Amino acid sequence: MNEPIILRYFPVLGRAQALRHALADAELAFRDLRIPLEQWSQHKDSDAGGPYGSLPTLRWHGVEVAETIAIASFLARSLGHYEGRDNGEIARLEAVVSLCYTEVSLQIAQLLWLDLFNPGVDLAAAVPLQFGRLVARLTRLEAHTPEAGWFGGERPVMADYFAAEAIEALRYLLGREHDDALRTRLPHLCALARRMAQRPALAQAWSTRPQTFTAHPDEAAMLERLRALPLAATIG
């Protein structure tokens, strides 16, 4: 299993799934190292945890990299995603990653952890707000999402991998009942996520896709509480 590329994260989707996709889709051999949370207090102050004792981390041919956003940009540079692009075009692609990570992936995770991080919170009041913000942000991304192909043009770049996982994150939270509503509000992002799921070089990644979004002890419990709430009316 001894790879010169190593991506380290927990056995969950949260902050790293897009990064897994970028590496698999470039047909790089890499070790998808999934560190269990029970074993993580051992890795915090070791090399796997990196300078800041947090995940994800990447090792790329001897070079250690930390933090999801920095890794994304490092990979974009390393895979040629910015070749022939001026700073303005690059910044547009980095805005997409940044928006998907900050406003969607971290927020979906916060919604799942909301009880344990905000004791006594009224889910029925708090969720519609935070969720409504989250959909509003994706709604604006959708307005600049191309009808065909990728943010990267004829080929996918980091923005594409993050945008597709932002849709899967949202779909995971809502459940399959509400696919029709998503397709109505986010048609171009939905279609892009579908295209990404069909890429042959991602077949193994889909095959080994992690089941949960965070390491929440009972995430299934939290979801059914979240899905009891009227989130569909927020979309429409």
- For residue 190, the minimal CB distance to ligand GSH (Å) is 3
Quick check: 158 and 76 in contact, CB under 8 A? yes
SS3 label, residue 82: coil
CA 91 vs CA 50, 68, 98, 209: distances in Å: 27, 17, 10, 30
Q: Which of residues 131-190 bind a copy of itself (CB under 8 A)?
A: 136-137, 140-141, 143-144
Nearest-CB residue for ligand GSH: 190
Quick check: 162 and 130 in contact, CB under 8 A? no
- For residue 95, the minimal CB distance to ligand GSH (Å) is 22
Residue 167 site contact among ligand GSH, a copy of itself, none (CB < 5 to 8 Å, cut-off depends on kind):
ligand GSH
User: Residue 154, class by beta-carbon neighbours within 10 Å (0-12 exposed, 13-18 middle, 19+ buried)?
Assistant: exposed
In degrees, to the nearest 5, what angle opens at C-alpha 84 toward C-alphas 80 and 89? 95
Q: Which residue has the tokens 């897994």?
A: 20
Asked if 42 touches a copy of itself (CB under 8 A), the answer is no
Residue 193 site contact among ligand GSH, a copy of itself, none (CB < 5 to 8 Å, cut-off depends on kind):
ligand GSH
Tokens representing residue 58 in the block: 């990447």
SS3 label, residue 9: strand
Asked if 28 touches a copy of itself (CB under 8 A), the answer is no
Q: Which is nearer to ligand GSH, 87 or 198 (CB)?
A: 198
Per the annotation, binding residues for glutathione are 183, 190
- Contact residues toward a copy of itself (CB under 8 A) are 51-54, 60, 63-71, 73-74, 77-78, 87-88, 90-92, 94-95, 97-99, 102, 106, 114, 117-122, 125-126, 129-130, 136-137, 140-141, 143-144
